[PDB]
Amino acid sequence: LAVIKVVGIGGGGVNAVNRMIEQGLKGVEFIAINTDAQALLMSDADVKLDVGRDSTRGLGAGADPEVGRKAAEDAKDEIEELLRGADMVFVTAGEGGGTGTGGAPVVASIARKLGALTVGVVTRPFSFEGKRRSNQAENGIAALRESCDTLIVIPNDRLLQMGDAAVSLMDAFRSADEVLLNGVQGITDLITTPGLINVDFADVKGIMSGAGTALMGIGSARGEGRSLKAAEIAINSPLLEASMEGAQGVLMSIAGGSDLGLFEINEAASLVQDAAHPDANIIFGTVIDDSLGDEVRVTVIAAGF
Amino acid sequence: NYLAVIKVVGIGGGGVNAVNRMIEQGLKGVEFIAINTDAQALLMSDADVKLDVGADPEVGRKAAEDAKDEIEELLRGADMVFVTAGEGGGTGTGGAPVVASIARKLGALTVGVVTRPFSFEGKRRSNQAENGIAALRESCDTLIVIPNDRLLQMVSLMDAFRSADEVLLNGVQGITDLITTPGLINVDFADVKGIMSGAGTALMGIGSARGEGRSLKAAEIAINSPLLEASMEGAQGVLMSIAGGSDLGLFEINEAASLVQDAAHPDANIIFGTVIDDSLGDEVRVTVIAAGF
Ligand SMILES: Nc1nc2c(ncn2[C@@H]2O[C@H](COP(=O)(O)OP(=O)(O)OP(O)(O)=S)[C@@H](O)[C@H]2O)c(=O)[nH]1
């Protein structure tokens, strides 16, 4: 029985976590960490830690990653005591600001020192947010990559090539929330709510330990050929950056109702094998989600390029 | 007065987190108080009462001494006060003895709970973990000490940390449930205060079993628990609680009570009772608190 903790750090990471809780992600503990007390009062997370209170006064790191790093580092004994006991820790954030960029690698190092399987799931900021945010994100992601077993990086620019062409700014960030949720859930649900093909904590640990930098694809479909269509959308996802063909490690999850049959699961698995690198290690798992109706949802995590 | 007022104080990050765990598990019958002692960080809490007085012990001490009047008003009216800094050190280990000394000067039966870290955790300067224990011991009636090393005789690294949190919770719940939650055998609060006032250091033992002979079996595990450090023979004050379902029988109960008397020192005071927790199914859980020598 694996204990899984999902940490959101900074405003975007805390909003993603609220989204995960709102959509009913189960079997995990939710921890919100931020440098803004008011923002934390609105969070529904199980654990809420306000950090950098004297350096920031509950107003955020003002986009300075050094302030975020030092806020997390000063609270490190306390974060450690919140994490101890976890088998698996997710660290989620929008890279580019001060709190998430700076604090995420601290939270991840602590998880990794404890020997929890440590997965980062972060976005790169949209190009329209400016060169400073993109540059801070890039350094934040390099730092985090040193501290995580696997680091899933979602390029927010690619999200604009999905969903609706007439989205607002608020919509774009809700979509970033959703994808961070998809990243976490596509993995955690293999463990907490397996279907016919059970990929347990040990299997996940074996493919994700020390895997390095990763990308994700997602796909969903209904009606005839839903499994094949969902997998083909996930494999060709703009978030995966056309790089599925080069990944050496691939974890795939297919979610559907109680009645998702082996035939459908296997058809999706077969399309994914064919698209993969010839020497790829691919693990295929299933998820029971009875709220899905006639839809199935495929998530692909690709690493080892 | 007649429903004993019990206040459980978590202080510092490990203490507030312990209290938040107690709330999450539905520990009943007590009032929870979360005291944050760090200037730079605040762990939030759903405790009834919260005080933010904000990793050095001296820092926590000074912060709580500064807030001594408001802590006093939070504690006034309690018959019993538990204080803990929970797992890991920090400012809470400095604040805990201050809250304890205020509880005790008010007349409340003051019970500290403190953990000794696992040895593989290493050690911070100035012997600060033992200084915390010594200072907390000076200001409590009873100090329950949980030696985390002993858990490894009861294991993976994650299991070790999890068992530590679980036994810490039990350090409070085994006693509070005995007092606050009816069972077939109930106790007098005066007798609790009789064994625990001025008693000094105590240790705890736990045991669980199912099926035939469950009560005897869980009691036997509890009495021989590595966490008791074989202090059962010499102990002058013993509390034993047996938690189980409604159908817990008087005969099996009494067999457990008889075992504890036999195992304990001839001159021991023994307080014994049961707790009805209908969520345990066919399982029985025993807590033994051994105090004195
Ligand atoms: N997923 C998600 N991402 C967001 C949201 N708001 C902003 N972002 C993204 O996250 C990045 C970091 O912003 P944010 O998380 O708010 O900063 P912070 O880490 O809290 O940093 P600060 O203390 O300096 S204000 C932004 O550059 C943007 O790309 C949100 O609501 N949800």
Instruction: For residues B174 and B216, state if they share a domain.
Output: no
For a pocket test of ligand 1, which of A6, A14, A15 has the largest count of ligand atoms closer than 8 A to its C-beta?
A15
Q: Is the CB of A16 under 6 A from ligand 1?
A: yes
Instruction: For residues B149 and B229, state if they share a domain.
Output: no
Which helix (H) or strand (E) covers residue B217, if one does? Answer: helix B214-223
In degrees rounded to 5, what are phi and psi of residue B288? Answer: -125, 130
DSSP string across A130-152: -HHHHHHHHHHHHHHHHH-SEEE
Locate B36 and state its tokens: 């944050």
Which of the listed residues B172, B198, B224 is the one where a domain comes to its end? Answer: B198
Instruction: For residues B148 and B4, state if they share a domain.
Output: yes
Cβ atoms within 10 A of the Cβ of A106, count? 26
Q: Is the CB of A63 under 6 A from ligand 1?
A: yes
Strands B49-52 and A117-124: unpaired
3-class secondary structure, B253: helix
- Give the residue numbers in B contacting A (CB under 8 Å), as ranges: 13-14, 17, 20, 24, 38-44, 54-55, 86-90, 157-158, 161-162, 165
Instruction: For residues A121 and A40, state if they share a domain.
Output: yes
Total domain count, chain B: 2
Locate A216 and state its tokens: 């994700």
Cβ atoms within 10 A of the Cβ of B102, count? 26
- A87: closest chain B residue by CA: B158
Instruction: For residues B214 and B194, state if they share a domain.
Output: no
Which of the listed residues B198, B230, B259 is the one where a domain comes to its end? Answer: B198
Instruction: For residues B158 and B142, state if they share a domain.
Output: yes
Distance in Å, CA A171 to ligand 1 centroid = 14
- A49 and B43 in contact by Cβ < 8 A? yes
Instruction: For residues B130 and B178, state if they share a domain.
Output: yes
Q: Which residues of B147-164 are buried (b: 16+ CB within 10 A; e: fewer)?
A: bbbbbeeeeeebebbbbb
Question: For residue A225, what is the domain's CATH number?
Answer: 3.30.1330.20
Instruction: For residues A176 and A102, state if they share a domain.
Output: yes
Residue bearing tokens 């459980």: B8
C-alpha A290/C-alpha A271 separation (Å) is: 24
Instruction: For residues B220 and B274, state if they share a domain.
Output: yes
Locate B111 and state its tokens: 């019970």
Which of the listed residues B167, B198, B229 is the one where a domain comes to its end? Answer: B198
Q: Which residues of A194-205 are buried (b: 16+ CB within 10 A; e: fewer)?
A: bbebebebeebe
C-alpha A210/C-alpha A197 separation (Å) is: 24
In degrees rounded to 5, what are phi and psi of residue A186? Answer: -65, -30
3-state helix, strand, coil in chain B (%, to 5): 45, 25, 30
Instruction: For residues B11 and B139, state if they share a domain.
Output: yes
- A51 and B41 in contact by Cβ < 8 A? yes
Instruction: For residues B117 and B222, state if they share a domain.
Output: no
Q: Is the CB of A9 under 6 A from ligand 1?
A: no
Structural domain of A168: 1-210
- Give the residue numbers in A contacting B (CB under 8 Å), as ranges: 3, 37, 40, 46-55, 71, 74-75, 77-78, 80-82, 84-87, 114-116
Contacts of B54 in chain A (CB under 8 A): 53
* Numbered residues of the known binding site of B for GTP: 13-17, 90-92, 121, 125, 165
Q: What is the number of the ligand 1 atom nearest to the C-alpha of A96?
A: 27
